[PDB]
Design a protein around this ligand. Sequence first.
Ligand SMILES: *[C@@H]1O[C@H](CO)[C@@H](O[C@@H]2O[C@H](CO)[C@@H](O[C@@H]3O[C@H](CO)[C@@H](O)[C@H](O[C@H]4O[C@H](CO)[C@@H](O)[C@H](O)[C@@H]4O)[C@@H]3O)[C@H](O)[C@H]2NC(C)=O)[C@H](O)[C@H]1NC(C)=O
Ligand SMILES: *[C@@H]1O[C@H](CO)[C@@H](O[C@@H]2O[C@H](CO)[C@@H](O[C@@H]3O[C@H](CO)[C@@H](O)[C@H](O[C@H]4O[C@H](CO)[C@@H](O)[C@H](O)[C@@H]4O)[C@@H]3O)[C@H](O)[C@H]2NC(C)=O)[C@H](O)[C@H]1NC(C)=O
Ligand SMILES: *[C@@H]1O[C@H](CO)[C@@H](O[C@@H]2O[C@H](CO)[C@@H](O[C@@H]3O[C@H](CO[C@H]4O[C@H](CO)[C@@H](O)[C@H](O)[C@@H]4O)[C@@H](O)[C@H](O)[C@@H]3O)[C@H](O)[C@H]2NC(C)=O)[C@H](O)[C@H]1NC(C)=O
Ligand SMILES: *[C@@H]1O[C@H](CO)[C@@H](O[C@@H]2O[C@H](CO)[C@@H](O[C@@H]3O[C@H](CO)[C@@H](O)[C@H](O)[C@@H]3O)[C@H](O)[C@H]2NC(C)=O)[C@H](O)[C@H]1NC(C)=O
Ligand SMILES: *[C@@H]1O[C@H](CO)[C@@H](O[C@@H]2O[C@H](CO)[C@@H](O[C@@H]3O[C@H](CO)[C@@H](O)[C@H](O)[C@@H]3O)[C@H](O)[C@H]2NC(C)=O)[C@H](O)[C@H]1NC(C)=O
Ligand SMILES: *[C@@H]1O[C@H](CO)[C@@H](O)[C@H](O)[C@H]1NC(C)=O
Ligand SMILES: *[C@@H]1O[C@H](CO)[C@@H](O)[C@H](O)[C@H]1NC(C)=O
Ligand SMILES: *[C@@H]1O[C@H](CO)[C@@H](O)[C@H](O)[C@H]1NC(C)=O
Ligand SMILES: *[C@@H]1O[C@H](CO)[C@@H](O)[C@H](O)[C@H]1NC(C)=O
Length: 372
Amino acid sequence: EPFWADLQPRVAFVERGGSLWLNCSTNCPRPERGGLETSLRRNGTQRGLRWLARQLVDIREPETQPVCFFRCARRTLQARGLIRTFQRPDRVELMPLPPWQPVGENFTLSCRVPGAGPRASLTLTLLRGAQELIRRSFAGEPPRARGAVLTATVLARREDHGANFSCRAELDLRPHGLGLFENSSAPRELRTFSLSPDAPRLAAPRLLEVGSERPVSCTLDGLFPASEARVYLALGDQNLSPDVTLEGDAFVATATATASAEQEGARQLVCNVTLGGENRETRENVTIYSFPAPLLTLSEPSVSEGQMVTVTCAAGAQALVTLEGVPAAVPGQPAQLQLNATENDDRRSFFCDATLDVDGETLIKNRSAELR
Ligand SMILES: *[C@@H]1O[C@H](CO)[C@@H](O[C@@H]2O[C@H](CO)[C@@H](O[C@@H]3O[C@H](CO)[C@@H](O)[C@H](O[C@H]4O[C@H](CO)[C@@H](O)[C@H](O)[C@@H]4O)[C@@H]3O)[C@H](O)[C@H]2NC(C)=O)[C@H](O)[C@H]1NC(C)=O
Ligand SMILES: *[C@@H]1O[C@H](CO)[C@@H](O[C@@H]2O[C@H](CO)[C@@H](O[C@@H]3O[C@H](CO)[C@@H](O)[C@H](O[C@H]4O[C@H](CO)[C@@H](O)[C@H](O)[C@@H]4O)[C@@H]3O)[C@H](O)[C@H]2NC(C)=O)[C@H](O)[C@H]1NC(C)=O
Ligand SMILES: *[C@@H]1O[C@H](CO)[C@@H](O[C@@H]2O[C@H](CO)[C@@H](O[C@@H]3O[C@H](CO[C@H]4O[C@H](CO)[C@@H](O)[C@H](O)[C@@H]4O)[C@@H](O)[C@H](O)[C@@H]3O)[C@H](O)[C@H]2NC(C)=O)[C@H](O)[C@H]1NC(C)=O
Ligand SMILES: *[C@@H]1O[C@H](CO)[C@@H](O[C@@H]2O[C@H](CO)[C@@H](O[C@@H]3O[C@H](CO)[C@@H](O)[C@H](O)[C@@H]3O)[C@H](O)[C@H]2NC(C)=O)[C@H](O)[C@H]1NC(C)=O
Ligand SMILES: *[C@@H]1O[C@H](CO)[C@@H](O[C@@H]2O[C@H](CO)[C@@H](O[C@@H]3O[C@H](CO)[C@@H](O)[C@H](O)[C@@H]3O)[C@H](O)[C@H]2NC(C)=O)[C@H](O)[C@H]1NC(C)=O
Ligand SMILES: *[C@@H]1O[C@H](CO)[C@@H](O)[C@H](O)[C@H]1NC(C)=O
Ligand SMILES: *[C@@H]1O[C@H](CO)[C@@H](O)[C@H](O)[C@H]1NC(C)=O
Ligand SMILES: *[C@@H]1O[C@H](CO)[C@@H](O)[C@H](O)[C@H]1NC(C)=O
Ligand SMILES: *[C@@H]1O[C@H](CO)[C@@H](O)[C@H](O)[C@H]1NC(C)=O
């Protein structure tokens, strides 16, 4: 006292990878030496009498304490400064949501903002839409501390399905006159779902014939989102493409199928739905049969009175036949009737009863032909 050594400015705040000027001086009349201790890269530089100046550029260092030294009178004169690099949130990220999140299942939300500083100036917010869920001021984290993460565990709500969630970070440079700088991570929309036991209730008649169209329905309730769930219904390889009704959490699929001409109904009826990563499938055994329509013929179909006529009917040998009350004799093949034409037999029609049993189910076909 005297002398002294001064560095200007003593405190400095700059952009990361940014630059500034430093003027370090002393009152020493004939400095025997002078210079600056720092690790930072220098672009330009200046100097003069009793004062030396440096432009330091590309500063990625969160905290650096450079020191200007002047050697005078075989003695060292040191002045230490402080350099801090602030960070704008050019990078704000948020973790992938569950592709489907079961409603009622706790899931977690993490917001990672790599390279954020100073940590003590940061207030982070995890929020659903306009409403803040969790807010964290990091003030009091060490001056050298950089980076910020916020995790919040959350219960899944049904009314919160389809909303937009985000992580908003707020940096306060207001004390330094630089002011607030805030940013928002890419908003993520959540997909949720719900299910239930009691596999789908499918209703169908168990008997089927080709060339005939019969309706079949499959339903279930307590399913959300109803609209976002897709359902499949088919007979064997053949798809029914049913009419799908959706009311609230319940659905209705109605169609009218047609038998496929092949074997079965040892085939099956498959009703399944896929929502989220889950599926509930119920199956139904059934029966498709082939029952050839019985043919009724007469020769001559129109005859004079008294002329002998013949009449026959056949089920294809696999079914039993009743011809005008007369059973097939013998059963394995068609029966017959013959007579002399009668005046009272004009406009007389005859019945042919074909009976085929499958799974105990008795099937009949009434077919008649009038005589002229
Ligand atoms: C869904 O997520 C939530 C959020 O993490 C969470 O629910 C919690 O489940 C746990 C275990 O089921 C419970 O947590 C605690 O349970 C004890 C009883 O053993 C309570 O006494 C606790 O109350 C105090 O908790 C703090 C102490 O750690 C106190 O500081 C505070 O003042 C409370 O008085 C606490 O509830 C509980 O069932 C809930 N907790 C809450 C508050 O919701 C869990 O991860 C998921 N819930 C499920 C799966 O049911
Ligand atoms: C309803 O839910 C059911 C869940 O089981 C689901 O079943 C699937 O049906 C399809 C046909 O519709 C299956 O078909 C596959 O077809 C291809 C040929 O194109 C095969 O390569 C597949 O191979 C499997 O089976 C082979 C033997 O045939 C094996 O060698 C092989 O290793 C495989 O196991 C298979 O035959 C399909 O496998 C099933 N299952 C699944 C998990 O998809 C049905 O699709 C659902 N309906 C809808 C629209 O959601
Ligand atoms: C250190 O890195 C520097 C970059 O950070 C490089 O800068 C060299 O020098 C100048 C200044 O940076 C560059 O720009 C030139 O600017 C003048 C105009 O000068 C303006 O400012 C003066 C006050 O100084 C003012 O009086 C004038 O009215 C202007 O408004 C232009 O006319 C030039 O064409 C030029 O663009 C140079 O480009 C750059 N040098 C080279 C070779 O590119 C430099 O590499 C390092 N050194 C210094 C001293 O900065
Ligand atoms: C950093 O070094 C000092 C800051 O302390 C600055 O020195 C300045 O130099 C000018 C030169 O014209 C001074 O102007 C005159 O100096 C004479 C003495 O040489 C004096 O008699 C005059 O009255 C007048 O002041 C100026 O005073 C001086 N500034 C200060 C604050 O002392 C220099 O400009 C700075 N350089 C850089 C690159 O920052
Ligand atoms: C949260 O933000 C999203 C947008 O980021 C809002 O939902 C969006 O609604 C629009 C308009 O219906 C959807 O647009 C399109 O729908 C057609 C179907 O007609 C589809 O083909 C397009 O590909 C597109 O999806 C859009 O899907 C939907 N956005 C998302 C992310 O699903 C929503 O309204 C906002 N929620 C709140 C609470 O404000
Ligand atoms: C906000 O985030 C976007 C996307 O990462 C980024 O490009 C942008 O620089 C940020 N804006 C501000 C001013 O923080
Ligand atoms: C459906 O098919 C299976 C063959 O795996 C059979 O065991 C079962 O008895 C059938 N169901 C009915 C109701 O007949
Ligand atoms: C019907 O035809 C048969 C066959 O020739 C004949 O024997 C019989 O007399 C005929 N019956 C009558 C009542 O015409
Ligand atoms: C004859 O036709 C009627 C009307 O379609 C039907 O209800 C009945 O089952 C048939 N008779 C027999 C024995 O198949």
